[PDB]
Amino acid sequence: GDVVSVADYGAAADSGEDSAPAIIKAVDKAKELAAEGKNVTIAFPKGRYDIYPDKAERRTLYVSNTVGTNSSYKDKKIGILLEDTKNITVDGQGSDFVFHGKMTTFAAINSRNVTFKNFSVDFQVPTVIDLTVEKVDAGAKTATVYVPEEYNYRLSGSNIEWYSDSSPYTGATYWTASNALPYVQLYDTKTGLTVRGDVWTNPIFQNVTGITDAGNHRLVFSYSSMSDKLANATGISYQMRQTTRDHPGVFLWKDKDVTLKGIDFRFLHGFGVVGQSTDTITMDGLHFGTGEGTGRSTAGYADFVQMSGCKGVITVANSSFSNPHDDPINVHGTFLQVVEKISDTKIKVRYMHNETAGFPSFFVGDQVEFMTKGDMLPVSDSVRTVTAVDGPDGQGGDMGAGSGSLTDIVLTLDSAIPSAVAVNSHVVENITYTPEVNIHDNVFKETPTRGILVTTRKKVTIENNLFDGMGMAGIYISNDAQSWYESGPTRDVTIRGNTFRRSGSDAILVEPTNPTVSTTDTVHKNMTIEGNTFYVNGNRVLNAKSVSDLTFRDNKIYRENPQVSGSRLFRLNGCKQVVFGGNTYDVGVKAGIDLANMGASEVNVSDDSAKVGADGLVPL
Numbered sequence: 001g002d003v004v005s006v007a008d009y010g011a012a013a014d015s016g017e018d019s020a021p022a023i024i025k026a027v028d029k030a031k032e033l034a035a036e037g038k039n040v041t042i043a044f045p046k047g048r049y050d051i052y053p054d055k056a057e058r059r060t061l062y063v064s065n066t067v068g069t070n071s072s073y074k075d076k077k078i079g080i081l082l083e084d085t086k087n088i089t090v091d092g093q094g095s096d097f098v099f100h101g102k103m104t105t106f107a108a109i110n111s112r113n114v115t116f117k118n119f120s121v122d123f124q125v126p127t128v129i130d131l132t133v134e135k136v137d138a139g140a141k142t143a144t145v146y147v148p149e150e151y152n153y154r155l156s157g158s159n160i161e162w163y164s165d166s167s168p169y170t171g172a173t174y175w176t177a178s179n180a181l182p183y184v185q186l187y188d189t190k191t192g193l194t195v196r197g198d199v200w201t202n203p204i205f206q207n208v209t210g211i212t213d214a215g216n217h218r219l220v221f222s223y224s225s226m227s228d229k230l231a232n233a234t235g236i237s238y239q240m241r242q243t244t245r246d247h248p249g250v251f252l253w254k255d256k257d258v259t260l261k262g263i264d265f266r267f268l269h270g271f272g273v274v275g276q277s278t279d280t281i282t283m284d285g286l287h288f289g290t291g292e293g294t295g296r297s298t299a300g301y302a303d304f305v306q307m308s309g310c311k312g313v314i315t316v317a318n319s320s321f322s323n324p325h326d327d328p329i330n331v332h333g334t335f336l337q338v339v340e341k342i343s344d345t346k347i348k349v350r351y352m353h354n355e356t357a358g359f360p361s362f363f364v365g366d367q368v369e370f371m372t373k374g375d376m377l378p379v380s381d382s383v384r385t386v387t388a389v390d391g392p393d394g395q396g397g398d399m400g401a402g403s404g405s406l407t408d409i410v411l412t413l414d415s416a417i418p419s420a421v422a423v424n425s426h427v428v429e430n431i432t433y434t435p436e437v438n439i440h441d442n443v444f445k446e447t448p449t450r451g452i453l454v455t456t457r458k459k460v461t462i463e464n465n466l467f468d469g470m471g472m473a474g475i476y477i478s479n480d481a482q483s484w485y486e487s488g489p490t491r492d493v494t495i496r497g498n499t500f501r502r503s504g505s506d507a508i509l510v511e512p513t514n515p516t517v518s519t520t521d522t523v524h525k526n527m528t529i530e531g532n533t534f535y536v537n538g539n540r541v542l543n544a545k546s547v548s549d550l551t552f553r554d555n556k557i558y559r560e561n562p563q564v565s566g567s568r569l570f571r572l573n574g575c576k577q578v579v580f581g582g583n584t585y586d587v588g589v590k591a592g593i594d595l596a597n598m599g600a601s602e603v604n605v606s607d608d609s610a611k612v613g614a615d616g617l618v619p620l
């Protein structure tokens with residue numbers, strides 16, 4: 001069909017003009033034709049574009065894993081919004097979008113078959129101030145601080161003030177701030193490794209007797225004392241930020257068959273790409289991170305890809321992540337916990353985490369399973385259909401009769417509930433919103449947190465990925481109704497092809513948060529782990545916890561660096577039907593296995609040179 005262009009409504013490529021009123025005009029046009037039946041392709045004549053929040057769309061939104069029922073941060077601000085429509089494909093043709101203030105960069109709601117392709121995303125003054133410490137001198141107690149061009153500032157002797165550009169409609173400034181920001185993170189520009197440190201103490205901002213400008217973007221900080229940290233500080237990018245997920249980066253809440261291709265995510269404000277209930281998602285050729293031509297150290301405010309409680313097939317292909325303030329991909333759901341039995345067919349359940357609430361997670365016709373929090377094992381034959389939902393609607397409204405608070409939902413099940421269910425004792429899980437997952441040919445580098453996180457009972461493939469500098473657990477498969485309340489239990493996890501290296505901690509770490517371990521029945525069933533090359537410096541390759549019919553074959557392990565401590569490569573807590581079979585353990589590695597709440601009658605190293613309980617240190 002037809003191809004509408006932003007050019008005709010006021011989008012002037014390379015103008016520094018609010019292109020957001022024009023966008024909102026063109027998206028209306030785009031809906032009219034689509035609703036006639038067409039296949040609109042909103043196109044952006046190539047070049048820069050400025051998008052300010054002033055006249056952007058304002059929507060009330062409770063999003064997963066942001067700020068839950070906070071009333072300050074309810075009404076968000078999308079810049080490119082595809083609400084209730086179909087068959088639209090937004091093509092920036094390689095343009096560089098640059099947003100302003102604090103806003104959601106683009107969203108899609110109540111849509112089916114829309115696509116975003118081929119453009120850049122950045123912010124004019126980033127909301128995460130990354131200062132590098134270039135030199136320091138312990139003598140007269142001074143320091144040097146590189147602050148990139150992107151950040152605007154103004155000094156008043158002992159104190160420093162940061163601010164943003166102004167609002168072209170009011171002449172007013174979008175965010176002001178001072179000295180140390182609440183939370184801070186560290187990436188070593190030289191050694192290239194993200195060693196986080198006490199995120200509440202920023203040694204740049206301690207006893208600062210006076211700040212002077214050395215020109216050329218530098219800064220000379222005077223000091224009273226100067227502790228161990230501030231001295232060794234040479235070459236560390238202290239990435240200052242705040243810990244309020246006030247906006248999602250991208251929002252995709254109730255969509256069907258979206259695609260995100262070829263978007264350079266140079267910076268997002270607020271969070272990452274929140275998908276929150278969506279039948280299928282596909283994410284090719286994305287690049288999260290900045291470049292070395294830039295002086296920026298983080299393209300993440302926190303997460304990058306969040307897929308809270310989605311369906312169909314979540315796909316991440318041919319992409320790339322570098323230095324976030326949270327994980328790259330975390331696919332999951334959310335456990336709500338039963339806080340009342342209104343009938344043998346009617347229950348009230350509650351959003352038990354403060355950062356996740358507000359939106360509805362159950363839809364009439366859906367299917368819920370029940371779960372005992374103790375072992376995090378599912379109640380036998382508890383699976384049920386939902387017949388009426390009385391909750392919030394995620395826009396601050398009512399669904400059905402209502403629930404009376406954004407933290408509670410009221411469900412009615414097709415048949416009476418299994419009798420074992422008890423208030424505050426069992427959590428409930430929406431099993432219909434369970435995404436199959438395919439994560440292939442991506443690269444993740446220098447993250448401080450984990451690499452991937454996937455917790456779903458549909459098929460799970462993680463094939464031919466490169467993990468380098470994973471500062472924590474390379475891959476983490478949790479499932480947890482203790483603290484975080486992120487569902488759920490996995491059932492088909494295959495982890496082929498990948499290459500791990502320079503891991504700071506474990507590589508693969510399955511670890512439900514069940515406080516009662518069970519040695520008769522296990523939380524996760526079925527898992528295969530093969531084709532993989534691993535590079536270790538005396539670390540755990542696998543760290544199971546309540547897995548069954550687990551397999552660790554065909555892999556290869558080498559000592560990273562060209563008698564001893566350093567963990568045995570394998571640790572298993574409460575597992576069944578494990579097998580090992582045909583691996584390649586380098587000389588010097590501790591090719592052994594630690595059991596725990598578990599007996600060696602459950603391991604099959606008959607076809608393998610791993611040792612159950614011994615170091616098994618490989619010789620020449």
Ligand SMILES: OC[C@H]1O[C@H](O)[C@H](O)[C@@H](O)[C@H]1O
Binds near residue numbers: 065303326327330484
């Ligand atoms: O479980 C780790 C934790 O990591 C981040 O903080 C996310 O925001 C949470 O939703 C959770 O995924």
